[PDB]
Structure formats: structure tokens, C-alpha cells
Design a protein around this ligand. Structure first.
Ligand SMILES: *CC(=O)N1Cc2ccccc2[C@@H](c2cccc(C)c2)C1
Ligand SMILES: *CC(=O)N1Cc2ccccc2[C@@H](c2cccc(C)c2)C1
Lengths: 304, 304
């Protein structure tokens, strides 16, 4: 028992991190097979970030201008191309530690682990969620760009995020591994504001099921609700609307605990209306929304 | 910017995890050099756990009864000994992935990362703290025993914990890598209750400094306090007493922010007395105590 905000083991991703330097800018790269993926703003100076024309800036860059170092050894760059907001640097050596992998573009509400790196070296690993406004709340300082987000299914690493920037409010924006930003963000030092950071309702419900499985049951009430009634309350509290697809995904958790999804929705409704009253659920004084129903099942069953 | 509960990159520890089976019990082992470390209760049946005499149970075990599997390959056990509550299984092959390592016995309040494993395979990584009552609040199911806690300083892994058991209240107990339990716990299926889980005051203050560094400043007040005055309030709220050693350790954070330690103590005092009033600090509605002053410095500076 016990329920923790758990990240995937980072080993498979650590074996892929490299340092990429272009001129005076150093960030992180992801080395998979004979390609190193990194944010295209590695070619920019801080001054260029104000209004960069990446195709124009890239004309002045040759293969030998991208310095790629894996550990303490230099990789030879034999090609380079820009795909959306990422650069793909073809190297002459396939990464011997390349795991089985996929590039996936996740949906808001989905969680993933981030291996934060500086100068191609891992500093730490934590669990994130793609927010409903397409930002993430990470921990990223200067030099962290190029750090990646991922999920693992047994031996296959699905890369879903690459860090590119911090908004003026301290929230983070980045791309999938094809270089497409999540949300409307652009890789430019311009004021870009995030939309409403709503709460991932299906994730809160999943975490309420994890709480019941682990002994925290004080919040269970004598009520039930309907999707429409619940959603009127959810809208009022800036919670994402709950759909029948979300109810379906919670099915296994509902089955394991014997608590119908709509009954858990009514418990959540009373928690929103009445508050926690100084109490905690799984050591938290707020409703946690960065565990998906799949994460709850995985952690509660011990998937390796 | 942004502040996350971050675990160390787990790669170096993943390369050490093995499966240890004795009879019908399977748990995790830590393979360092030519020795595999695992909880001595691997020799027990669930029935034996009620009142086990480990020396007696061990007489019936030979080297060939301990089945050690690293990945999908079997290791040959050429020796075995009991050191306190851990078994040391001498194998004929040194672990080729053994990192630089130390065995450290940590103090309450110190944090570490846990790589939770099942059948020698890693399922996830999370950050823990050794509580003041010598328990940890982990996420451990049956099969997780033998999973280890650790800290990393650049390339040296300091192993500090090995998981052995869950108390009837769902909190966890284990040993250092010499087999000595943290606290008064014994590896027996007997009712053992934990003492008061007090709050790690120095860690809360460190996290309040991290909040200020990251923009969360609403809680800063116009007051100051003394160690004795603060401690009268801390005792009332089941917080650990703050010492001049703790004040000294917070010095770098006090210097970076320009907020004197005793001024932050007064802010903490008002937070304890007045509550959060529905507000959050670094996305938490309660005062976080599982970041040490060293963790705050490390994360805020990007140590790899
Ligand atoms: C993520 C990171 O480390 N940086 C540092 C950096 C170096 C060189 C150019 C730009 C940057 C930063 C930046 C600023 C404004 C916009 C974007 C997309 C990145 C991020
Ligand atoms: C940590 C873990 O997986 N287990 C399972 C287990 C297998 C075999 C014998 C005992 C145990 C469990 C246990 C029960 C009571 C006390 C202690 C020290 C361990 C823990």
C-alpha cells in the first residue's frame, strides 16, 4: 500500500541524452539511432530569440557548427535538417544504448515523466501532466531545453515531449518529437499567455479511487449524481467536463473498489462544494489531477 | 523556474536490480560487485513471518537454494551470510554495471529516491524522506521488498535504504545496507506501531525559500521571531524543534533570497497559526517537508 507521485525508471532515457552546442548556446539533445533531436533555438543567441527567422539563421549553420558530445566523446555530424521546431542532427554513429521507442503526441490530461538535464547530463526525474491549456508545470532552468518527457510500456519508450521554453508566468511549453508545439505556443521571446488551467476531472476521480484502495475513505458520501449534474458543478469549479469516455476508462477502478463512477463523482462534487475542512487525501490537502486512471492501475498492480 | 518533487536519475540503480528467490518467496536484490544484498526474510514463508528465528531458518538453506536472476540470466551463488536483517549472497560474477557506491545510514529528515521493483524489474522512481519516527511513506506492494533508497553525488550512488516491511497502518519500514533497521522495527509479522510523525521543520523552511525563489511570496510577513519563540509554536503543531545547526544549513538560502532565517521562521509561525486560507504554495495546500535545504539548492542550481 501507499500511493506516490511516481516517475518511470529513467535509465533508458539517460542513455540517450547528449549535449548540443551551436556557437555560444548549449542545450540537451536526444540521441536515438543515428539522429540527435534538439530544439531548433540552439542556433539562436538570446538576442535572436526576440524575433527569430529560423530558416534564415539556419543558412549560416553547417554540420560542423553543431557540437554533439555524448558523455566525454564527440559525435560526428554528417547531416542536419529542421522539422517544425526541432533540429535533427544526423550523426555517423548509431546510439548503442538506443531503446525500443516511439514518438507519440499526447492529449491534455495525459501524464509523463521528465528527465531534466543540463549539458547533456541528467539532474533528476519527475512526473508531469500535459495541462488542458497545453502547458506543463515542470522544473526547468536555463540549459534544460532539449530535456524530454516520456512514458514506458515494458521495454518501449514513447517520447512525447521536448522542453523548449518558459512562459513569463513560469509555466512551461514544448513540442512533441516531431517538433510540433503543444498548444498555440511559438519558440520566440514574446509574451505568450496561457489559457485557463482547468483541473483534469478524470484524473482526480482516478486518484480518489487510489485513495479508497489505500485506506483513505473519509470523503465517500451517501450520494450519487448524473454526468450532466456533475458537469454543472465541474464547470463552476474550472474542472474539465466529464464524458462517457472518461466513465468508461474508470471502469476497472470502479470494478475493483465496488464504487460506481457516478457515486465517486458525487463524492468529488461534495469535496468541491464543502472543501477538505483541514483534512487530507493521500497526504494532499488539494485534489490531485496528475495521475491518469492508467497510472493508478499501474501503480496499484505493480507493472514493471 | 518551477519546483518539483524530483527523484535522482535511476539508471545507475536499475543496473543493480536482480530477482532473488528462496523456495516460494521472490523479492528484489541489489547486486554490487560480486555481492547481492537482499532482506533476510526471503528465506521465510508467510507463516514463518509470525515469529521467525532467522539463524535457525538459515541452517536449512544452502547456496543453491538462493536463485538469483539478473535480467534473464542466472547468477551462480558461491557463498551466503547474514548481516543483521540482510543476506549477502556472494556470486561468481561481479556486476559489470556496478557504479561507484557507498553505504550510508541517514538521519531522520533526510530525503532519498526509491526505485520500486518487482521480480528484479523497476516499476518506478519517487522521492521519500526518512520520517522523524523512522518510517517512510512509500508505495510498496507485495514483491517490492529489497527495493532500495539512494542519493547520488555526481557519479557515486550512496545507498541508504532497503525496503523490508509495511506496518499495519500502511507506512513503511526498512534497513540501511548493513541490515540495521531505521528505528525500533523488527522483521516480524507482529503489530508494531509508529511514533508521532512530526513535521521536518528545516525542510519546510527550505521549501518556503524555494517558493520565494520561484515567485510564491504571498506568505512573507512583516514579522520576525527567535529560535525559542518559534520552537514553542513548533512544539504545539508537532513540528521538529529548530536548532542553530538547522539555521546554519539554511544560510545559503537565506543569502540568496535576502530573507533572514528567523524572518522565514516567523512566516512559518503565521502559516501554522492562521492556516493557508484556501491558498497554495508551489501548488501545494499543505507545508511540504520532503525537500532538504540541499535538495532546494541542488534543484534551484541544476546540479547534474
Ligand atoms: C530552455 C533553455 O535552457 N533556454 C535557454 C536558451 C538558450 C538560448 C536561446 C534561448 C533560450 C531560452 C528561450 C528563450 C525564449 C524562447 C525560447 C523558445 C527559448 C530557453
Ligand atoms: C516487501 C514484500 O514484498 N513482502 C512480501 C513478503 C514475502 C515473504 C515473506 C514476507 C513478506 C512481507 C513481510 C511480512 C511481514 C514482515 C516483514 C518483514 C515482511 C513483505
Amino acid at each position: 500500500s501507499g500511493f506516490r507521485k511516481m516517475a518511470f525508471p529513467s535509465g533508458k532515457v539517460e542513455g540517450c541524452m547528449v549535449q548540443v552546442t551551436c556557437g555560444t548556446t548549449t542545450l540537451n539533445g536526444l540521441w536515438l539511432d543515428d539522429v540527435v533531436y534538439c530544439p531548433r533555438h540552439v542556433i539562436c543567441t538570446s538576442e535572436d530569440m526576440l524575433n527569430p527567422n529560423y530558416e534564415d539563421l539556419l543558412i549560416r549553420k553547417s554540420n560542423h557548427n553543431f557540437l554533439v558530445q555524448a558523455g566525454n566523446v564527440q559525435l560526428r555530424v554528417i547531416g542536419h535538417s529542421m522539422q517544425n521546431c526541432v533540429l535533427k542532427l544526423k550523426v555517423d554513429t548509431a546510439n548503442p544504448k538506443t531503446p525500443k521507442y516511439k514518438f507519440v503526441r499526447i492529449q491534455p490530461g495525459q501524464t509523463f515523466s521528465v528527465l531534466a538535464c543540463y549539458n547533456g547530463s541528467p539532474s533528476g526525474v519527475y512526473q508531469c501532466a500535459m495541462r488542458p491549456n497545453f502547458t506543463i508545470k515542470g522544473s526547468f532552468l536555463n540549459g534544460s531545453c532539449g530535456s524530454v518527457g516520456f512514458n514506458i510500456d515494458y521495454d518501449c519508450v514513447s517520447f512525447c515531449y521536448m522542453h523548449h521554453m518558459e512562459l513569463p508566468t513560469g509555466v512551461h511549453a514544448g513540442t512533441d518529437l516531431e517538433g510540433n508545439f503543444y498548444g498555440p505556443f511559438v519558440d520566440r521571446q514574446t509574451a505568450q499567455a496561457a489559457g485557463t488551467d482547468t483541473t483534469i476531472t478524470v484524473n482526480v476521480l482516478a486518484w480518489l479511487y487510489a485513495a479508497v484502495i489505500n485506506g483513505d475513505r473519509w470523503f465517500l458520501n451517501r450520494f450519487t449524481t448524473t454526468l450532466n449534474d456533475f458537469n454543472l458543478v465541474a464547470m463552476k469549479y474550472n474542472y474539465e467536463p466529464l464524458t462517457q469516455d472518461h466513465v468508461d476508462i474508470l471502469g476497472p477502478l470502479s470494478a475493483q473498489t465496488g464504487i460506481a463512477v457516478l457515486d465517486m463523482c458525487a463524492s468529488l462534487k461534495e469535496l468541491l462544494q464543502n472543501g477538505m475542512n483541514g483534512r487530507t487525501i493521500l497526504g494532499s490537502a488539494l485534489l490531485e489531477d496528475e495521475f491518469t486512471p492508467f497510472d493508478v492501475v499501474r501503480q496499484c498492480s505493480g507493472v514493471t
